From a paper:
Microbial epoxide hydrolases, cis-epoxysuccinate hydrolases (CESHs), have been utilized for commercial production of enantiomerically pure L(+)- and D(−)-tartaric acids for decades. All these three CESH[L]s exhibit high sequence identity (>60%) with L-2-haloacid dehalogenases, which are members of the haloacid dehalogenase (HAD)-like superfamily. Studies have shown that both RhCESH[L] and KlCESH[L] adopt a two-step catalytic reaction mechanism by 18O-labeling studies.
Numbering used by the authors:
A (entry chain A): 40 to 276
B (entry chain B): 41 to 275
The structure:
Amino acid sequence: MGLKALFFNVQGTLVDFYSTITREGEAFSAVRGFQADWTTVTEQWRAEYRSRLDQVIKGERPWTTTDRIYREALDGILANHPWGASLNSADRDELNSLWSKLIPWDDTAPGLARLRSKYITSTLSNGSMASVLRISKLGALPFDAILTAELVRSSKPDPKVYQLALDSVGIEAHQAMMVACHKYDLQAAKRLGFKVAFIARPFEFGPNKKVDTKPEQYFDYYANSVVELAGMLGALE
Amino acid sequence: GLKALFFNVQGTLVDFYSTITREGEAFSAVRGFQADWTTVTEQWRAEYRSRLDQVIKGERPWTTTDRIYREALDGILANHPWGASLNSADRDELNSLWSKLIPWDDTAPGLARLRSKYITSTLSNGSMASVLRISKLGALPFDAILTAELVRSSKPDPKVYQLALDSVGIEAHQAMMVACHKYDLQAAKRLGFKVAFIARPFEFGPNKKVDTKPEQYFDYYANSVVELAGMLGAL
Ligand SMILES: [Ca+2]
C-alpha cells in the first residue's frame, strides 16, 4: 500500500529538447552553408505543433501520431524562413527525427536507474510510443515499461491517460506517483489520487529563459534532478 | 532490413511449468499435504483456455488474464481433495506466480545481445501488469512491454500484431515475431512479419512431447534466444 510505481513525463521532465533541436539544427544548417536562428525555429515549431495538436484534441483535425503532427507543423513553419524552401522531403524527415532523439539531462539516466531498483518505473507522456521508445533507447534510459497517451488516443490531462497507467501496472492511484516538470500534469494526477513529484527544470526552454520552478503546496516531492528524487525516496543502485 | 523483434513470453522466454511445480511444491509443504504438482500445469492451462474462450466468444465481458487464471485455479482445485486445504488467500498468492515466471537460462543473455542491435519488445497475450513484473523480476531487458491487453484481445487477432507495428512505428517486413508457438508465427507471417521459432522441448515439462519441428515458412529456427542472436549477427 506504499508507493509501488513511478510514471514519468518525458519532454523537459527527462530530456532537453531545446538543446537537441538547436544544436543539431545548427549543424544541419552550417553544413548547408545558410544562416538560421534555431532558437526561433524551435519555438515556432513547438507552437505550431501544439496548435495542431489542440485541433486534434478538439476533433477539428483527424487523429494522427504526434510524429506526423511534428512533420506537418515543420512544413508550416518552414514557410516563414527563406532557406526552408530549399529543404527537400528527406531533409525535413531528418529534422523531424530529432524529436525521437531528445537527449537526456545529465541527471536522468543515473536517477532513473536508482529509482528502478526500488520501484516499477514507466513513462507516461503525450508523445507517440515510437518516439518515446527511441528516446529511451538512444539515451540509455531504463524503464520497466513505455506508456504514452497514444495507447488511448488522447493526451494528458485526460483522466484516461492516468487510468491507462494504473490499469497497465495493476495498481491503485495512491500507489502511483506522477513525475513531471509541468504543473498542469501534476495537478491533474493529484486530483485523481496519485502522489506527485515535481522536478524543477530551469533550462527547459534554453539556458536563458525563466521557467516556473517554484514549489507548490500539493507536491508530495520537490526535486532539482531525478538523482535528487531518488535520494529523497531512499532509492539506491 | 530488420528493425524490431517482438517476443511471445510464456514458454517462449519463461518456464511456467517449473515455476508452477516448484511454487506449488512449496505451498504443499508449508500447509502439510502432498500433491502431484507435475500434472497441475497441464490442468491449469486447460481450465484457463476454456475460461479465456468465454471472454473471446463474448459470453463474458472483458476481464484481465490474471483474473481468469485465478478462476481457472478454482476450477482445477475442485478436482483434487487437497485443493480444499488452499483457502482463498493461498490461491490469491499461488495465482501470483503467473507474474513471477522463471526465465530459461538463455533468455536474458539472448535478449541483451539482441537489444544491442535491434529494438525489442514483448508481444504476448497476458496482462501488462504480469509481463512487466516477469521481465523486471527476471532481469529481462526490453525497449518496450506490449501485450494484447492494450487492445483488449489476444493473438492471433490481427489487431495485436498491428499494435506492435503502430507502437514501434515500423512496417511489417521490418518486424519479427519470436515465439515457441506455431499459431502465433503463422498469423504474424501471413501479416508480412518475419518469424523466428525457438524450440522449447520442456515447455510442458520433462515428461510430455511437444511439437518442436521446423516449418518451411520460419525465417529462423533456433533452440535458444542466444542462438537466435548469433543467427541475427548480434554476437
Ligand atoms: Ca525497458
